[PDB]
Amino acid sequence: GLVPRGSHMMEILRGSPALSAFRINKLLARFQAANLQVHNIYAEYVHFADLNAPLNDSEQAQLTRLLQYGPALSSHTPAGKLLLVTPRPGTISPWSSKATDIAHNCGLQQVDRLERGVAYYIEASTLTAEQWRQVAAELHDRMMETVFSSLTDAEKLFIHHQPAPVSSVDLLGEGRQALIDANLRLGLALAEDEIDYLQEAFTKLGRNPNDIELYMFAQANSEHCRHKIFNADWIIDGKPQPKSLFKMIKNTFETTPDYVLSAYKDNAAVMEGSAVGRYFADHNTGRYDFHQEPAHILMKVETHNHPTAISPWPGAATGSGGEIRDEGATGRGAKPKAGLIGFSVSNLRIPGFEQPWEEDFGKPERIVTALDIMTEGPLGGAAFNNEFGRPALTGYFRTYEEKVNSHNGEELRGYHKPIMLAGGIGNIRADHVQKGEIVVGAKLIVLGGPAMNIGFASVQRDNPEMERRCQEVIDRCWQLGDANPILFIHDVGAGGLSNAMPELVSDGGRGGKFELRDILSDEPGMSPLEIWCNESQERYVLAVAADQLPLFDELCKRERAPYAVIGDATEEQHLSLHDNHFDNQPIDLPLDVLLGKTPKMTRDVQTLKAKGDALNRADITIADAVKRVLHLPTVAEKTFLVTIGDRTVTGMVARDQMVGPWQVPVADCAVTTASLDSYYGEAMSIGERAPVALLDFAASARLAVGEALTNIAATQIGDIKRIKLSANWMAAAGHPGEDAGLYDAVKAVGEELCPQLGLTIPVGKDSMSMKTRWQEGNEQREMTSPLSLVISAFARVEDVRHTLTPQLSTEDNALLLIDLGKGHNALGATALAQVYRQLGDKPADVRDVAQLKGFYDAMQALVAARKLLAWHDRSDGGLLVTLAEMAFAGHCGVQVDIAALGDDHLAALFNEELGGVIQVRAEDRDAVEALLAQYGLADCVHYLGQALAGDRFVITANDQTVFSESRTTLRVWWAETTWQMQRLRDNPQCADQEHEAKANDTDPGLNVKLSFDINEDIAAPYIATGARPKVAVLREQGVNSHVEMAAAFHRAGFDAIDVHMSDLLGGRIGLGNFHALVACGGFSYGDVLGAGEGWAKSILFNHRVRDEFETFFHRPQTLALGVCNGCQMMSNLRELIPGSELWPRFVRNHSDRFEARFSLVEVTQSPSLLLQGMVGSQMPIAVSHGEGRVEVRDDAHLAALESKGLVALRYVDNFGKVTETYPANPNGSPNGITAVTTENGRVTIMMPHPERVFRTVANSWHPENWGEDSPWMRIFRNARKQLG
Ligand SMILES: Nc1ncnc2c1ncn2[C@@H]1O[C@H](COP(=O)(O)OP(=O)(O)O)[C@@H](O)[C@H]1O
Ligand SMILES: [Mg+2]
Ligand SMILES: [Mg+2]
Ligand SMILES: [Mg+2]
């Protein structure tokens, strides 16, 4: 289908079936839900290749071949009305970018841009003209897509628009009315005092302000960027206040500057880490080596709220993405390590799962429902974390939408405008913590992908791989130690370049002259205002010395990370933006003019305090209360938000959400090791309790600090001063009583609580318009969020191994409760109250500062002395939930008595006061109690009872049964939410299977069977000779699992070398000098055009390199391992590998969702050399993949594979049998297949990640007697011995 397009040719190539069986059954059942009689529906992908030059015969074949991918589903001949859905015209989907890279990397330079769409074929002869428009709607997201009626209509996507000129606003010729008009038109949202500034400014200059200059100024001065509320003066109840919000927060740093390396001086904070071995490839040798040096820790937590309300997936994706840029741009370069996610929404109201407290209060048309946010949002954030390569180890998810009697009387409080939170931690070198000086004449560079028109405008666009490439460049720079060319690096986020650049030069006491036409752009038609102010993603601005340019270029190219020099640093503090096309100057301004601050903001507010009504307990019984509480999304299991995101990448994850043999998501905090050779590390926890604000502001804030602390309490940290905090404030500024409450809240923690505990707040952010106004019926309605503080705690871990979890032990034990509520048992603004549609009287609060510090100090002591068996703090759901979740984690029973907890049983069980339950060895009870008394906690400590093998959850009181149920029953109820979420989001069959497996109490959980000695380093004799064979650690743009892959081969005695595909395509390296090659995991090219396919075809199409691989595979004694993406890549290299004729393809999972699981596999009999002596073994392994399902060409191909004896690994359930049941088998591979070898066994490919779990500490769960090495370390040692 080759049709012209003015200057280029627009080729139309037909793709494979786009929708799976269950997906189609869903669409049809959804059509009838609107009375649309549709006989049958058939979707099919269609590719559109806008190419410049002609495509030769052999090249046309290679193109078609690039475009044949994905699951081999049922293919039908088109029939019915056609509806082509494609990205909206003038927009370039991320798919287009990655797919076009591949085309280029395959030598198809003629391809100007590849783009995809989905051709729907609907048979429904009954539908009217109007009913059709209704159908087209169900088939596309109006925010980013459009529907066509012809495959020809796709030409409208590659149109060449003429470069738009800069527009001037005639102030000199029309007066102030010119700025008034533009402010409205361009939508600048400038306050009267700002228009005055602009008027005087340009009057003094004597010229007209360009639109680009006005927008740039407007963006720099918005609330989001200026934070006027946080720096404003205050008058509360007719009384002037001495400090601003910011100043009060800075107070925590003044009283406690301990361990802080940087704060409020970067877009991230830095704290002291631990001296450990930083592992990376040397610049000169290309070999990975351990560098003994301090690995300081940086942190940051951001919010991408508003965007998420309009378009969830991209809104969440870019929220995490922009935050990753802030970490990477810390100082002169830093490396992101682990992530965290936060979500706050209104009631889910899941169809057919309506909860007792849920009421429909309507919502604005312009935004999406609570459910859609939780359906697409998490996938969006996880998408960026997965494709980029940083584990998502902790987070929170809370629902709240209720008409309640609060500070401003009866109102609708909730989250129609959601809280989308993303943050993380990272490592940074000591000498890079401080930003260097910007020398005059320094080249100003933009690192990242070509800009597009973004910022309806709230619909973002993420290209995670692009950022992965950029990060690799930043990594090469800081690894150059002193030679690090990066002088000053800054991230590009809000305000696009118009903000980022003026900020970079300004922070360096310089100015900058730029060239608009030096900026990389994907769409020519942009105006100077659009090229300079657009908010496209994956961009960094940095400064590099003139003489270091050749090096920076050498680095960017090797990583395929696009960059561009767009300006020069100048002496005079003056911003200049020249345009070469029109030969004019869009920007010409003195920096103090553009950055000139308007008068200080001053808020005169008054206090509002909610009356608060007693809890009406008419329909409240302890039994129904338990059932209700476990069904509140805030309390319920979060598996739908956890398994969708990677949790093992980097091989440094010690403690993830999933806990124990039964992998229950109840881990209170996250923990990572500082490196691949140390037991030190970092920790992350989250404290949040927003509902409490609807009654008391300071209390809610205090509780956030408290919970964060109690959630991290069971980790070996030491001095509390090591725990650094991040404070994120979500509020509805202007709303009655929120301003006085926010000040009171910020003060409560900034001036009082945090300084008293010795806790610093080096980072923070704000989002001040957390409200939503609309008209559902005939009148005005409003959904106001409560003041919402989200505290993120961070700390250097002393010993990663001593971290405690909620996994109970059935051995002789003692369940002790640390009740920090001091008997208060408050029920106000709790989960119990929410579950019965109420707010209640009085909420919880930090009752005694000294005891909270004492609590933490005591916990630190018990953790160091190894006197604790388990720990779980009390938060949402109360003591009931803490105990329930512990039982869930230990897969056992609980026998507790609550008579000493006060006469009010409901209160003792459902109050959300700080504290928790510790489990100690029975013989250790008295000593632990005495210790707990030493910190003055005796009155708060109460012996609850003990953990017992079984299925009974029994709560008594002096001699009466207060509550008793099947532990499995509570567990299954507690799961219903994630079950329902997975049913509507994933393959119903999978979600169901996973849910039903939890009802089977006989589940033994993950267990081990070892056919060999886990501690016998069989490679030691070899390593001892000093002779170290080199292994080619092969990566491609997008690979993110290469470092831990090299560290694994390193421990086995190899000298791992960093071999990038560019290195091969450039002749810098040759496989001839290697006896071993390993293809690493990740998301090469963002898995576009089939996971692993672009990477593989990149080799196959370049005959020189192709032969390099074939020659390697055809040698007599060479080894080759392929993990994950590598497994997928190599499976497409069958023609190059001898004895791989029977290998299968790896495609989309049956669940149709990314699976990051700790799955149990068994080592089967095969010629495989890397699995020597492991046959028969059964151990769990890291699984992070979305296209790992084995697929054969027909049953004959599968029988043939089985009879040839090529299967190396199979998934097995916890009972030991090979299973195709989910999630024990995460992808749905036939006969549990996830590893296959060749006839000679010299080549082995597999989906699981053995290299991520070679260290016992990197295993989510493992037997208590394992030493340093896990069973999987054997794979690597086997490779060394085999080489000799
Ligand atoms: N949005 C989220 N994303 C990822 N993990 C999450 C999210 N919300 C909760 N989790 C994880 O689920 C587990 C339980 O969450 P939650 O019940 O909120 O914990 P807690 O009770 O300690 O506050 C934790 O391990 C937590 O990190
Ligand atoms: Mg909880
Ligand atoms: Mg907790
Ligand atoms: Mg929490």
Side-chain angles (χ1 to χ4, degrees), residues 668 711 873 875:
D668 282 312
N711 259 326
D873 68 316
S875 60

Side-chain angles (χ1 to χ4, degrees), residues 666-668 686 707 710-711 872-876 882 885:
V666 284
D668 282 312
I686 294 168
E707 187 192 350
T710 73
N711 259 326
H872 200 206
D873 68 316
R874 175 165 69 198
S875 60
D876 294 311
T882 281
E885 295 181 337

